[PDB]
Write a protein that binds this DNA or RNA. Sequence first.
RNA 1: AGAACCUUACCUGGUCUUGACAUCCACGGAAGUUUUCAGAGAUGAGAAUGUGCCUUCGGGAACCGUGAGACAGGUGCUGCAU
RNA 2: AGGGCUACACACGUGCUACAAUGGCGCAUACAAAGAGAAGCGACCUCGCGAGAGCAAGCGGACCUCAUAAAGUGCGUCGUA
Lengths: 161, 83, 208, 99, 100
Amino acid sequence: KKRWYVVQAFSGFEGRVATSLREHIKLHNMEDLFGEVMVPTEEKFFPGYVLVQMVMNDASWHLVRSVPRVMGFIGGTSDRPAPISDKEVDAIMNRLQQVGDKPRPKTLFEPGEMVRVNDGPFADFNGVVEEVDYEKSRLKVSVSIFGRATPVELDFSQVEK
Amino acid sequence: PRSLKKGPFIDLHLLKKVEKAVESGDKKPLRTWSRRSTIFPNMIGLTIAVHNGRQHVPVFVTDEMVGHKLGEFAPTRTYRGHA
Amino acid sequence: GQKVHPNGIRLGIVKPWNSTWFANTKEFADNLDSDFKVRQYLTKELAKASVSRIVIERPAKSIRVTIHTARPGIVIGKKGEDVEKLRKVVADIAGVPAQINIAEVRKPELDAKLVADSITSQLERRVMFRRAMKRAVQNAMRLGAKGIKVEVSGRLGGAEIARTEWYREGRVPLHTLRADIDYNTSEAHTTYGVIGVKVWIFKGEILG
Amino acid sequence: RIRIRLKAFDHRLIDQATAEIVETAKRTGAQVRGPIPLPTRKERFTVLISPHVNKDARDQYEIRTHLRLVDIVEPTEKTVDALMRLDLAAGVDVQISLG
Amino acid sequence: AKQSMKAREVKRVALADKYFAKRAELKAIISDVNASDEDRWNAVLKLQTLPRDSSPSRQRNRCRQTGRPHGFLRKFGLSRIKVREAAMRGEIPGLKKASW
RNA sequence: AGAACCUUACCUGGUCUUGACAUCCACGGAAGUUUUCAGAGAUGAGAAUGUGCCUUCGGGAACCGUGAGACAGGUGCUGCAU
RNA sequence: AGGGCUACACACGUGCUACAAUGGCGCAUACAAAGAGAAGCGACCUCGCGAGAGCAAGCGGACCUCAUAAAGUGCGUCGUA
């Protein structure tokens, strides 16, 4: 049975830490002592901690701390470092490296009702967008104008999430 | 007629009844209002008294009746002649 | 059903609209319905108050009502007590922020609708219809109407055979589009049946 | 550029609105494009006017929706914001659109 | 129209409002050529199970004032007769008698 | 200015009776949300959630439930009462 | 819920399509106006003989879509059945 553990890396080199960790596993061939390795890296939460399915021998502990650009485990003590949970890393798994935003046929920025318009007349302005015309690349952001809530057809690039 | 992709139509309840009858091996007539129901291969042999608006008229199902619907064998209007 | 409606034929020229808003095909029907509701409510409420014309005007998701009434005092009641009360109910009816204005009708004898209403009331309280009609006509004339016509119809004096009678005074040109013809109607729900009252009041011709 | 689509049933009212908008634009900013009249929508309706029956008896109504296209070429900081204050005549649906 | 009819209409509308998401989904499933036969069958049966008044093709457009089924207009939500009256009164904005 | 269902007012059966639609109290329950078997369906029986605006606590306004009646309802007749 | 208003010896009213060559069919090709459109109009492209289907932009619209106007014109054919 392999339980989960938290590894701290130099924040920003996290995907390279994950790749080097998989490679150190397949070098020192303790293949039966490692299950998975979650190391996200957006163009990113959590952009600083690497989740490792593992068991605890002192050999595997020295292995993970001999992986380069790794500070150490995070637990109660450094003798016997602490597991956490499977659900904690579970959330990260879903969006580990899945196509998040970016490559989209319409929405370039989360609509909801929080955006700012700058590529137009609305100099340093923000408003709430109820409906949106992504198909025809149009937004109905209701910016506080004329003492009310009148919307204005804005451009996706013109506005900013 | 109905689209081939949609399949044949039979009322669910009617179908269930038919199934029950089959299970039993009984030949007592099943009174039914589903005139819109298509006849099925398993319904062959059964008497099924189809409503014509007014009364249930007994229809002994045959090999030839399969593709047809139950309402086809239960005429509603009752015209004898003008003289 | 010979005659064209005198208000309706003149909306483009000398008469204005009551409901005065723009809406796309989406929200138009709903708006109309709302207007109907609010107007109905107002009529129900301000029956005892002499009310001529409710003018609805909705800009920017907020309804502006304008009540034309002969006596504001009974519609307003105490210093913004009754008006305020009316407002919230109006808002509720609409589903938007409400604003009630109250226009004071100068010369209620020259306002046609008001006159009609009065006549109806008279009929209801069992006066001689003819005498009422005469009063209506005379009063308007006195007040400075270029002309007036009034017409009442059906079960007059509770008679079995219904008929219509009408009194004209001065000139009341209906074919002339530029004539300011204040037309309006009412209905007396008497013991013998309904008695419909029409009244045309010719203020004068507009030159433009 | 700010395109502005004025829509109304009364033409005079619309005209008034347009002028006002122009005025608002012109004091603050510079080079207002102009009040360009688009085609009017004459949405017609026929109805039977009898309560019961008489089909040749009819009234033909219409709603003339007028369009005014006002454009503003240079959106400054003062100009665009100004719109909020300057209140125009009622029953005139405006539709501003930057770019 | 009667009160009863109006009530019925209202009920139908309510039902439509309620069951739209499910019904639509079912329809989609039925349509989808890239799908299992059994699944399709189930969907078809499922639809049957749902109430009839849930369909939007059940509800008739009636006049919003009188409930008159015939002579209806969509823009106004009113039957011809009432529409005309409204027009005459000035109650429909922009609407006036047209000649050309 | 549009009857497959709906529309529909008509026929056949199956059903309801202060009622599908309103107002009023009394008092049982927050509304509603999801799902189960029988039934042609109407309807007739089950499992999960909630207690918001305020109380010298005899309780309330929205929204279901039951009984009493006051009433609702009628595209029923008279266009030769209007 | 199902049926009926869609019944059918018959009579009348109002229409459409015809009986043809001033035409029918085939191939090419020209010139409109006025409207509608968001639980909507739906290009292009792909598949289907076709009705359509799939994918899916542009568009609350002098912008995009419905949407190729047809009679016509030219060339061929049929030759009064």
